[PDB]
Design a protein around this ligand. Sequence first.
Ligand code: PLP
Ligand code: PLP
Lengths: 420, 416
Amino acid sequence: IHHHHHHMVVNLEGKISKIGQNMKSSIIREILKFAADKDAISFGGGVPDPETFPRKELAEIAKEIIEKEYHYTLQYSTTEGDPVLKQQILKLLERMYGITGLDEDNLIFTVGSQQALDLIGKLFLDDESYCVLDDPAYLGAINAFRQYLANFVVVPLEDDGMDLNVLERKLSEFDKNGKIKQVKFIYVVSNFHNPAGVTTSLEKRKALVEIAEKYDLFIVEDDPYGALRYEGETVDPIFKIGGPERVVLLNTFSKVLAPGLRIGMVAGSKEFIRKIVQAKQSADLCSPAITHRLAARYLERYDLLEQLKPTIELYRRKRTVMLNALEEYFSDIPGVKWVKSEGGLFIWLTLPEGFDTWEMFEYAKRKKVFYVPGRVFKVYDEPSPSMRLSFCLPPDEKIVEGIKRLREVVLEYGKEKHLL
Amino acid sequence: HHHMVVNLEGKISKIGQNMKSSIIREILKFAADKDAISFGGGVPDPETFPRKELAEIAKEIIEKEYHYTLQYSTTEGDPVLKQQILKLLERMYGITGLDEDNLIFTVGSQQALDLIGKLFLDDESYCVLDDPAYLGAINAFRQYLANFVVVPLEDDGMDLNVLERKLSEFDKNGKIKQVKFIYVVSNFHNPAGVTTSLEKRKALVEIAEKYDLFIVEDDPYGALRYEGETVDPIFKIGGPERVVLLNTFSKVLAPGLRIGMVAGSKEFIRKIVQAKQSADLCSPAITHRLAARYLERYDLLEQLKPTIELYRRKRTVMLNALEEYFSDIPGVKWVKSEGGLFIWLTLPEGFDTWEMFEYAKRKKVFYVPGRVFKVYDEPSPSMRLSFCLPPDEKIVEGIKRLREVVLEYGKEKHLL
Ligand SMILES: *Cc1c(COP(=O)(O)O)cnc(C)c1O
Ligand SMILES: *Cc1c(COP(=O)(O)O)cnc(C)c1O
């Protein structure tokens, strides 16, 4: 009534920065909205099983540290992070990976490894910069980086890691056009990739360090899942191979302790870490001291690597159930393939050419079986015949039943499209 | 060679280049020494925290509510907490008419400042703030290459004559679209201690409406009032279409929870959700649910009373000591704060509280030099003092130390 206000809205939308205009929302929650319905079976999870968390122990420690250590735990803390937790982290890295030679100034804690990704983006990426990552890649990293108007150099991922031939070709092109200064870093997930379940070979790890050196790049090694190994041996981290001069290591408590703590660990050069401290201080002053000290006391009192063993046994069992069900129900469709993940939370399944797992998702919802369509993990959002599956949450019998439902989905959709 | 350090510095973005570290950590490095007395703190006294109440609740929500507290949560924040905030806003300020989609929780009010800056500021944008201003806002905004319209702060708030003159100049040069918002701290200013009068609050809303700006009202301290009556928030006057309201649990419950409350229009909040999700996915559910069950179970406004008695006592001891020990020094003034954590003191013309800091360090007495709160880093005769942490006897001893410093420096400068 000449009061079409919304105009106030267009004025606000008018005030939004370029970063603001280039922000993306994850659609995962929307599409998994009904995934917990009674007769639904969901493989769309990206999370650990909460039934595995040491809740009684964390609860007792939480009370104790608030009551007795409140001068630390309820008060503002340093941006640099809890030095008691730092001691425990330095110990874990040495016990887990044989990483040695670091001190407290090589580390900082973030609000998840997500904040680390966001702050690395903020400090290093702009509309004139490039970052190198996989196809497929972790969604959090794509969204954290793309908001800063970054350009991407996308390299296809193979069963043993990134295709280093493609990587070298692309980098060579940048060099020949005198644009290699615009390329900043390579983002990798070296153990049990999200979404691909792939583990980067030692030889490709070493080769990545060499390529980074040649083109004066650093490497951001995101490693949420390394402790969750079901077979084989732990591979040296890229961080151990290149050192903090060349590599930033991101670990998290999300997958091995509790997402709710929101604790990411960043290890790097003292110069790099000083810059993350500056960025984090303007971003949130500090992390909640409550979370840091809780984790720190837990780790002092319980050996995480030991306490993980029954959780590893459980996830291994479930991984094997899914891989067996895949072999039983997906072995007669030519062109189907999947990564036989040796750790972590995911199996990445790829259907034959022509299959579009986004288009197919309607048939899946109709059968109440859920996965993450592969397009979600593509920087440029093109159609995908792949999907991410997680075996972590459903009970064994539902893993088998869910995989049978997916077969039915594939057959229905495949036949409607004259692919089968 | 070690100068791939140079390569890394070459890789850093413009935002990364325009980033200011806080100096306060550096200047207060030795302020916890044995014989030292510090007025430099900007933090509450941990001896006032409801540590027993919070500890019990923490155990309960981790053990019994773990599906919520130990798992990822929504970026939007805990709805249980949101229902308590809606109640509190009404009981504290008489604010009504909001729902959950007008709220989000951030990792302190600091993250809210950072996300507002990210979303609204860039090298072609301006925001309006006070001289002096809160350092956390200065640093959160400057990182995004923002230009500042700085307005002198008077004892009852911003000089609005200056504000309207400067915005008029923008408007006359057709640049008013580049001005995004006005940042204010309406109760018990950090660092100034001042409270904006209701008249200036209403006028601020009019100006913002006239020039199509929004107002970011940062209010950490409103509940720590030692005398007088609570004033209507700017948010209550302009509403969510015009104003974003920032509250925090830091000064009234516990800084270590890292909980800022942001209230605004549903469109604004949705953009904040989008920005937060890429920044950190979500805040720790443990912190939110802890605060929620605390507020359900204990009346914060009642639990604050002994805290207010303590702080008010210390405040008066400091003012009384300033009276005793600065009475005979012409030109010195200070804000007789009625709330919050700070007294803002100004020395005579010619005194430079940065220069003078070396004499203070020598007497082992600490303050925050006023230049820290100045966007353009020019010399200041002022300093921020806090009365929260030192025991009463050290408040007196410390103010006497400060007198001796002012006299030592002033004599050397031939100002006294
Ligand atoms: C799960 C995951 C994360 C977890 O992020 P947090 O913020 O630490 O909880 C980070 N990176 C990758 C590759 C992941 O899969
Ligand atoms: C104390 C203070 C803050 C509180 O910061 P948090 O990040 O919520 O802990 C914010 N704004 C002002 C003006 C302050 O004085």
